[PDB]
Structures are given as structure tokens and as C-alpha cells.
Amino acid sequence: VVAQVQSVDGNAQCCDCREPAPEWASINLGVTLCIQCSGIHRSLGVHFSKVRSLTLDSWEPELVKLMCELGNVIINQIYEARVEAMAVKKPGPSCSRQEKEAWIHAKYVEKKFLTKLPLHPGALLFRASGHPPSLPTMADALAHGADVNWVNGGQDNATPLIQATAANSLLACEFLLQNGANVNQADSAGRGPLHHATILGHTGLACLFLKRGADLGARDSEGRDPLTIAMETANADIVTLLRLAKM
Numbered sequence: 337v338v339a340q341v342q343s344v345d346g347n348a349q350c351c352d353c354r355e356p357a358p359e360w361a362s363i364n365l366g367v368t369l370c371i372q373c374s375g376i377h378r379s380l381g382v383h384f385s386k387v388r389s390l391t392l393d394s395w396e397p398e399l400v401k402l403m404c405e406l407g408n409v410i411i412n413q414i415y416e417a418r419v420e421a422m423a424v425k426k427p428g429p430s431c432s433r434q435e436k437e438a439w440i441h442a443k444y445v446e447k448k449f450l451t452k453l454p455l456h457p458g459a460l461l462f463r464a465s466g467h468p469p470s471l472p473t474m475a476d477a478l479a480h481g482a483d484v485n486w487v488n489g490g491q492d493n494a495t496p497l498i499q500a501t502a503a504n505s506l507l508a509c510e511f512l513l514q515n516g517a518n519v520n521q522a523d524s525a526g527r528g529p530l531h532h533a534t535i536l537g538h539t540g541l542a543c544l545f546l547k548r549g550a551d552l553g554a555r556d557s558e559g560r561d562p563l564t565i566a567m568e569t570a571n572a573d574i575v576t577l578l579r580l581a582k583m
């Protein structure tokens with residue numbers, strides 16, 4: 337895991353201070369962090385950063401893949417975009433804990449070094465979550481305040497998660513879920529991500545949603561729960577998943 341995640345462009349230097357061989361990660365941001373900067377990320381709370389060990393914790397295959405599609409270079413291009421323009425000074429490995437704290441807080445909480453525009457972060461997240469998904473754009477949209485549960489109003493009332501489901505993108509779903517997407521948020525027709533996974537026959541996405549606490553009994557505007565759709569579409573694999581999840 338640590339060899340695979342550190343092998344990504346720029347992931348062998350800490351995202352925040354460039355400390356070599358970082359063994360920690362933020363799994364919602366998609367970055368590698370050194371002992372000291374990971375310690376500081378823990379200060380921020382789960383809304384900003386979910387800290388994990390590359391060496392000490394288990395990693396789901398999809399999440400390893402997610403890390404490999406983002407990484408320090410991509411995320412710094414977003415979160416440190418205007419550093420060079422602001423003539424401001426990024427901390428090095430040997431810098432004080434306090435200097436690193438002030439940088440990390442300015443970078444992720446204050447959002448101090450972002451560009452002005454990722455004009456519509458929510459809509460952009462929506463567009464970037466759909467086929468073909470752009471994870472760097474999704475990350476950019478999220479940094480600029482995109483609602484992870486953005487509703488496509490006046491239209492179908494779909495969400496970025498529903499878009500990622502239509503795209504059959506495990507990576508985009510995973511990224512949205514890591515960033516707080518409501519696994520149960522339905523469209524105008526009462527169809528949540530699990531409903532869409534089942535309609536489209538995406539067994540892997542259905543499995544993901546069930547693992548993340550998707551509501552098995554949720555009925556759409558046609559009175560169908562996901563099992564009903566799975567039966568009606570003659571999909572033996574999803575039927576089996578759903579019945580097992582019920583037990």
C-alpha cells in the first residue's frame with residue numbers, strides 16, 4: 337500500500353511540508369502526510385481531513401486506486417494554487433510545529449491559497465462526477481465549497497453521487513462518500529444511489545453502497561425497493577446481494 341501510494345507523482349514528499357517518505361494519508365483529500373502534519377490534520381476534524389496510516393491500517397482496493405488518481409501534486413495544484421502569486425512561504429521539513437499548524441489551517445480551513453474560481457462549484461462537481469469522471473475537477477469543486485450533496489434543481493434533482501453511479505465510476509463514488517455524500521439521498525422520483533446501481537446493473541456500486549449503510553427498504557415513487565428492481569430486471573447477483581444484506 338505504502339509503496340503503491342508513495343509511487344504516485346509527488347507522494348514521496350509530505351503534501352504540507354515536503355518531509356520525505358510520508359507514511360500517513362488524508363483519505364478524503366487524497367494526500368500523503370508526514371507524522372507531524374498528520375498529527376495536525378487530526379486537529380481539524382473529519383469534515384476537513386480523515387487521517388489514516390499507509391502502513392498500519394487496512395486499505396480497500398478502491399481507496400488505494402482513489403489515492404493514485406489524486407495525490408500531492410494534483411491537490412497542491414488546487415490548495416496551493418496562489419502560493420507563488422501571494423509571495424508566501426511554504427514550510428519545509430525542519431519548520432516549527434506552529435508554522436506547520438498555521439500553514440495547514442490556512443491551506444485547508446481558511447482556503448487561503450485557492451483561486452477565485454474552481455462560478456458554480458456545485459454544478460461543476462455534478463458535471464465532473466458524471467461520465468467520464470474527472471477526480472481532479474471534483475476535488476477542485478469541493479475545495480471551492482461545492483455541496484457534496486448538490487441537488488440538480490428544476491431538472492431531475494439528481495446528486496453528484498447519482499451521477500457517479502450513472503457513470504459506473506467506483507472511484508468517483510468512493511471520493512464523494514469519503515467527502516460526506518449521503519448514501520441515501522434520492523432524486524425527484526425517490527431513487528437513491530442504490531436504486532440507480534440496481535437499475536443499471538452495477539453490482540460493484542450496489543455492494544459499495546450497502547457496505548456504507550444504504551437503506552435496503554427505501555421505496556421510490558413507483559413503490560419499488562431495490563430488491564423489486566433487481567427482481568424486475570432479472571439480475572441474480574444484485575438480488576443475492578440485497579437478500580444477504582437483509583440477513
Ligand SMILES: [Zn+2]
Binds near residue numbers: 354355
Ligand atoms: Zn509534513
